[model samples]
Target: PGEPLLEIHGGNRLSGAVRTSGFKHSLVTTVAAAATASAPVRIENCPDIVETAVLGEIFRAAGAHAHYDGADETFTVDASAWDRAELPADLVGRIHGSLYLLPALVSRNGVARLSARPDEHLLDVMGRFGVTTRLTADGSVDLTAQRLTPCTIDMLDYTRNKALMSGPCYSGAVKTALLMGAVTHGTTTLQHPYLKPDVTDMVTVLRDLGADIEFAGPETWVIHGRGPESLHRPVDVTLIPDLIEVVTWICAGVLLADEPLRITGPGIDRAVHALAPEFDLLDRMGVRVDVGADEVTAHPLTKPLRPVEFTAMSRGVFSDSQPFLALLGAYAEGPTYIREAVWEHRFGFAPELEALGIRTAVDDTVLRVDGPCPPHRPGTDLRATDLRAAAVLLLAALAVPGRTTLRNHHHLARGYRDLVEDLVKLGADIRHTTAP
Candidate 1:
């Protein structure tokens, strides 16, 4: 397979409109939800990202038909004839989003053999929802369907003492639990469901398809599932713009722009609230930001940039923007501290920052950076370990003074829609080339 490579010259001032694509997290989960229905699911404003394509391929292998009409920016999933599809080792290994499809698979085929083991979070949910899951000696997972039993599940009880301190608070497992509960028989109640907007989006899609799910409390949910057959009708879902992508561009505009950047789309409210603390920090640093009804505009800083410190107050606070936040910290005038209470290993890209003369170190889950660290080299090439890290590299290239090459550009495509084209629209100097 051929992958794109990016050549970037830093210090270019970015401005203008950068519309966000549909949220990838919401899209992936909705795709899984579509499988529960016997009718076709058509999603609007879907991003042309690699993960969706790969998921479509996985569904195709299993007898469902999925096609994305790029001209209309719509993706259609016809899983009415879904047969037992073997979870491909290569594809399943690459996607954590694939975990959400487990309950759907169990609904259709009564069992799902996975390429990887279901984590404690997933296991806990499956156990409560009457899905029997077991790990083989070879570390593979086999999930079997049992009689659906609606029961009460306390999410906080599953949070172990050590894991609670340095991991996602409302994780994918919680979402998976909710999904499983939605398709199970009887009324299922979830305590402390970590009701982020993404979860809200999933619940909305499920209800639209006749899943009979409701939010009982701020952190609790009651899902009444009549089984897979309950979702019998097709749905036309309009996706919300990606907040993570919006945050990425906001960082780019604030760090590299000479003027304000206009971002317009739905779902900006959740992103704004999630990064409320960071926005406050940005305001204190003299960067002007305005949040309109459905749009956000950020102006370039007027004064010397000061470092900002953040502690992950909740799951929504740092969800997917922590890497970009760390990169933002790298260009600040002083030390910027980011304390992570989730996924201690998220800052895998920090080591590569050293190549550009940026000093970064980690203590447990906290990332510390002493900035005003300018890039001194042009010949260095950087590699990204994951999708979010790829955005970090791009932002790094934007901050440096000279040309920098970024390899594994496919990672960016997997996470962001039209990243190169979008940056170019904002006056970035970037050239993308492909290599085999």
Candidate 2:
């Protein structure tokens, strides 16, 4: 995949449900695990998802060697020569994965410090787990931890987070917790930490694979560590499903596919599927949805699609709802509204959808979309504002047809495992190039 050059013609409707490969969350956790590995560790079936790149930088700063064999989607990571001192500052603000360095570095040198974004005051949350974190006035988190000790407390009370930090905080924090737990071979409890079900699902998969971690109550957990070699042992784990990916895939239905789509994966039925029913579209159209413990499938509604409004909760927040909301609204009989209380700019990509022929409106708090729709004109140039929004743009291109271009696609590559390749394999006429 090159860049802006690749083009997708509008009018390709996709059928057949696609199965996802690997886990972005696990990749972050596994990369954190390498920080404590006695020798280089190899992970197979890994996708070059975006966050992995940021984690690679963290690994390098921690004095480890992390290399991705792009052809094979495998990573060769060795912590043998890893430097356990201060971490690099350049990539901190990019995403929250920077905090992942804490556990890896602490386990290696008993101290961890790294630079963060200028506005990321929330970096102090690491202190709760016994990692001393300081946010410099310049916007970086300097962390130092001698050894990780586990304690019990309420997770809901630890911090009141009202917004998304510049980086992947929850993922990095969980990675830090797991690394600490594994290195000490003792119990550590994290209470009232922000919980994203996608992050939790990925953490649980890592725990199942010989990492002793427990999620008790909604915001608390009791975890036991297993040191370095212990984490290397093989155990079975089903990759966690990407809720954002699921939404991106579903939005494709409204644009391109007419056949009902079915997605099967462990954790699929947990949140996204459970909330699908709550959307008025299912009721108004009489859509048959199959929500199972670890699987979910949706059939076309016999009736007309109706506008749906979902409250800001796990369903709306865990995964960015902008894309699916746009997709649903594009084909809706009336107006569809998405209110995002979790992040201020989550729906900033709505304007680009309007460019694709969907009726869209955005306010400081809510994004309104209406459609009884018309396909987007072929050969339109659109830029993706974020991860989920980028996927929505791609879905739009794939569904409507005629050489649509997705800009700033790096965001899409971060979250989606093999979007272009997968879609192309699944009957999509897609290509990647860079021609600005």
Candidate 3:
């Protein structure tokens, strides 16, 4: 985490085992929902990351008293005395979780204001519930809430012309819609709801706090609105380990290490439940991954990797790990096809891999990678595109027997505690250069 540049000399068998950070994606949405509650929300097993810290700031900006006990990984928020719904522009821009605070604010304060423009899908969802937004000359958005009511929205249909669901904020819009629906005066019906572990976590937390929500069908939800001041106060719950990091370490072991790298941690089983498709994809690719009581390990590929195809959407392969899967595709024996149904720009990192001699072509939302190519050339320099892209690029470099330089690893630091340290502990040879 020291510098923006990393010089990695690959081809070292991972020297040892490793553990992962706490479940982050689920925790962030939970925090957003908790921030809206009039109760004091106390959560445990929180991950220590930059984005988590920014979430606490978002809570405070919206008149919530939020604190994190880093030693024990517990986060406490008291939003009972909350006043306005205005948040700092820079603070809101820092994390995706920050965007949902608008719905949180509107539920209680009847209005929410932010400096930066949020996702259009969120605005459209809010509009259905009687909240209108205006952009000022200074480029800030002001939401004046009229009333909280029910509306029937199909996420797939609503997001057809709107591609935010195909981008990073897909779930965020869903969270906003759910929260708005839960607190309205009448029943809010969603035709097709986007459900996931984190979202389910939010639903459980809300239900525990006395809000009425029922999944009448697999893709439909009938939310009973109790209006403001209906939910119980003082919410408390524990979280699970990180899903993405668990898979990342698994791939790190498969691609970069010769010896099996033991990836162990607490509450791992709960997190892995959502990773069945990812694990299944690895199995199809001939990557040996074993799940134990509280751990998972990835063994070296024993045969030619299988070319697999998967769609990155709900209930299948999560789009978050598509970058890592793309790296796997680059190593497979034949062509592997990956479709990004949730995020349009998820394949934005495909072109970066070509510099390493990996053959990849992006045809709309599908990425086709022709693999079994020669080992990546050393002394190649690659640029980090985003958090996920940069992390996988490191894996690409670590497999090369010679030197490869990666710039802007600071993006990697945003989510990981210290993957470089984990790699170093596993016998990776890497040097850092402070930002220029």
Candidate 4:
């Protein structure tokens, strides 16, 4: 960390290997479920970062105590503090996982209040599970878990990405998958899964954990759940590779260094194609990517990567690659066009990146990023637009010389889980000074 706090020296290449820790996606959903537990819920394999802190703080404000026990790589949530059915706005707007709290809290607490305008995708997906949401002005949402009747939830609805996840979506779809399992006991089914390797891989993990779930079609799932009383002993499980994390690491590796960059992790085969379109654009200009079943390697395009226009395809929702499209466009030959046809406001992070010396334009549906990789001007304090953007900027910092202090780093901590410390371990000169 540099003075002004949090400065990173650019031009240094990453030589050593870094290990990935707990699951960000699984941890969020698991913590959300702590609202329903009468006991102090103990969640293993947690992502110990600011996102968890923010949500833990939200639970505290909602009448719950959520704390991380680092010695055990676990999280303990005591819901005795959750006196209210509703939640606060500052906590709700903190991140998207607020929606998961609705069912988790309402199922046990009778009513749930959240300061979030339910996203269109959330409403549609929740409806499939027999839950209805009422959105109010002042950005609050009231949730009522209607008569829990079993239903065949077709996740095929491209708009709803959080529907059938059993392990965790980005934070932990396992909670959602569990919720779906409860509602689908007569044999609940979720169709058109987001065939991305990691997600499907997550479904496999869920099955091993004792959820009576299985794949029926190429992109479909069947989950059987036991209602509230069915909640049983905690199960053991492992999380899949963080493709988003891999993306950030790969980006930082090649963009920050002049040498070849390699990332070793599972499920790279499926991610390669999902990322092929973007890498194809960048790789054309000298960016070389080699995909193996267990590893991914990226090298800076020997020449400036030529930009191309393309649509990002998906089954569930695409979280990690959307933000980098702008970076791709800025460095590519032509305008880089991206259509995040899956989730709402997926490109909100673009403007923030643009402010840092990149050129980007956004319409309701399409994001237009034109040529000219504008160098991020140093000595600026910028708020992290969201979880992904916060990390992307940090990745940018590894390539940008001099000091750039990212304010409100609380966002980065949420998804990356102890990111500053992790980056330092990998030899990245970055440090965090807490903000009050």
Candidate 5:
């Protein structure tokens, strides 16, 4: 990662429409799953994000043609002459999505190997499908082909803590199983699978590509494979909007601006419910947000923004939004508590927030913020560990005076394709600087 710094001039009122790009989760899974098809698959409205580029490199390493036309926001994956090769360790280690390729490769070829250790749950799910996994001497993992037996796999059983429903809650595991089942000879049943909007988009795209997939119940998916030969080219698949990005920008407007901003996209209505609870919480905290049929208009807070308590559960206000919401709490009046029941490490950016003069604490999965503290002065230096944390820091900087420099700004590209440009369009005085 390069040390790119972000220079932000705070206390600016942002206005105008900000549109979101395709969902990163949808783009990653769909493009990876497309590699299992016998013909070329073209994806439109694909974001020019870091993960997209990483997946392209992965496909190229697998002997497939992964091409991206940035001018038109389209990506094509040709796996007609697919072959398996050891994934590049350096590249694969940088992205967690690299694990998604295991099932695709195992389905296309009899064997697949990864240069890095993958999620334990990923291997467990593959095992349930009859795929065998063993660690190599070099610390890499190898998955061998087997008769993928169809069984009732409960995703809730895979989680140690009972937060949400049973079965597989991780979207990656569900996606991997979907790809594996597409090529298996018989029907595969997935119980309590994560039905997030992005997962729904992947299932829709796979169905478009001639995969015999159907929903057995609200949380159950049944896939009947007709073999790899049944897969065909999907003319074009358009990805869903990045709702996390949408909410990030909305938080940006709330904290840094006194004027409202308009946000619109095809994905606005699709997953609004996941954001509804949070939006309502924001409204109660004095930030006015108007939800419309086709778009959303967020008005600046007329009064002091007060801290509000909220609980984040799976399939509700997703864990992905926890970081941004926590940032919101930092600028509110009084203390706010956010109980995150999904991921354990969602508070990686908390220390960075404390550096900016906000009192923040993380006890287990719940994040506590004591504020109403307007970031009085600029933080000398800030760094981000992931895309969401980068956004949280950026939003925090926008609410403080003086110049704040943030390292690892490249992490922002993993989610928002044109984060600097989009924020600039909305009147944010932020610039990207390269270190000498």
Candidate 6:
């Protein structure tokens, strides 16, 4: 709500080739792992997002150097110089993914400190795996690496956190636990580890940094510990393109483009494999896509779009993509049902979408949308409450034939870079404007 608004004139036949960037989720953890490397680690195809910049701030505060360029889409971080235990306050609060760096911090400095209070799953897991904690006068926690040990824990079941606002802390906790356990004194296993496509790519990054990690079986990850000092120097790893982002562009192409829009980049195939559920939703919805090794060409609308019922809990169709699917449902011929089984409340965007002219209902974690939204009337101001929802608003505006204004441009900046400009190139009549 605090960011600038977007003015978009729809009815344009948006089309063109738009490239995809690396997974922001993987990039954060990749940078975190790089902090433990004795030499510089260079990552390719980096997304230009607030999280990327925030991590740079974090790396800088801890005496490491992290650099990124949008022109070439590369990020490099070197922590071989040293480590800082206490993180800077202003930088820490800018991102929730800061906790993913716990393993890196502890591995390098033997101690770590951020907020006076952090996620207890982390504290609990740390204690279970030989890290000790103390609550100090500053109201923040001080975590010290105390004889790192190999242990097994279930990281995928986040039911204890279902009632909380932060949603599941498994992703961060799993990565933190795996990274910390990777260099401990013995083999460590995580039962029920959640390995989303991007998280698996993060594992790729860790392996490239010379960590020994493997899946002994389904839901079981075994990391053979070789101590932290064994990490390699001057390594390079390229992150897979964010599957959700790739799917978003493809959805925009299918829903808004006159002809099939081409979404392309290296490692796209690497990311696309993880989106079968998302792809299945689109297929059931009657959107046709010509997917290739490196590009996805979206072709649709020979028949009216079909609405579908989907349970967002798989590796590819998780709650993160629910908002994007919700937008698609708004254009569908019938009511689309989205049941969120993984998280407690990811339907916060349903009400906002309902306000934008769809018949929507949120009962518990399920979202139902009756679509073919009425022609977006003029003079209606829109607000995107979060990152993924921000893209939905832009897509909604792209589907509208008249003028539409979208507020909260900052949220979009959190995960997307050059979208407005890229859409403009594809013929969207979208532009950035000062908030009124």
Cα lDDT listed for each candidate: 0.75, 0.60, 0.77, 0.59, 0.76, 0.76
Full candidate order by TM-score, most accurate first: 6, 3, 5, 1, 2, 4
- Which pairs in model 5 have colliding backbones? 154-167, 155-167, 155-168, 156-166, 156-167
Give the deviation of candidate 5 from the true structure as CA RMSD.
2.6
* Predicted candidate 2 versus true structure: per-residue lDDT over 71-111, tens digit per residue: 86677666767764545566655665555546666556655
**lDDT score of residue 436 within candidate 3:** 59
204-252: candidate 5 lDDT, tens digit per residue: 7778778889886887889988777888755477776677977886787
Q: Which is the better candidate, 3 or 6, if ranked by lDDT?
A: 3
Once fitted onto the true fold, the runs of candidate 2 whose alpha carbons sit more than 4 angstroms away are 1-3, 33-45, 53-96, 116-122, 133-139, 147-153, 157-187, 192-197, 201-219, 224-236, 260-303, 314-317, 374-379, 401-403, 431-436
- The digit string of per-residue lDDT tens for model 4 on 1-436 reads 3323455564455555654545565555555545544446665555556656777787778767777666766666765446754456666777766666665565665556656423555545555666667878976667677555555654543333334332123222323544545433366776555555434444443343335666667666767765544443344443445557766766666666555666765445555565555556555545577767867776764556666665554543354566755565676666777766544576766766665677788888688877767446676565666777777777766655666667656676656766777677666778655433
Runs of candidate 6 with Cα error greater than 4 angstroms are 1-3, 116-118, 136-139, 157-167, 314-316
Looking at model 3, the pairs that clash are: 15-426, 22-242, 23-241, 23-242, 166-343
What does candidate 6's lDDT look like per residue over 56-111, in tens digits? 88788878888887789889888777656567776888887787777777766788
The clash number for model 3 is: 5
Show pairs that collide, candidate 1.
Answer: 167-342
| Candidate 1 vs candidate 3, lDDT winner | 3
- Give RMSD (Å) of candidate 6 vs. truth: 2.9
After TM-score superposition, what is the CA distance of residue 4 in candidate 6 from its true location, in Å?
A: 2.7
Could you tally the backbone clashes for each prediction?
1, 31, 5, 31, 5, 2
lDDT tens per residue, model 1, 1-436: 3667788898777878877788887888888788777778889988888768887887787888899898878999977888975767888767667777887888678898866523657766777777788788878878887576788877775443333423453456667876787778888888776555577778888888789887767767888878878887778887777877877878877777887888876667666775666677666555667887578887766655678877663443554677777766666789988877655577778877778777888888788988867555666888877778888788778777798988877778778877878888888889977655
TM-score of each: 0.89, 0.76, 0.92, 0.71, 0.91, 0.92
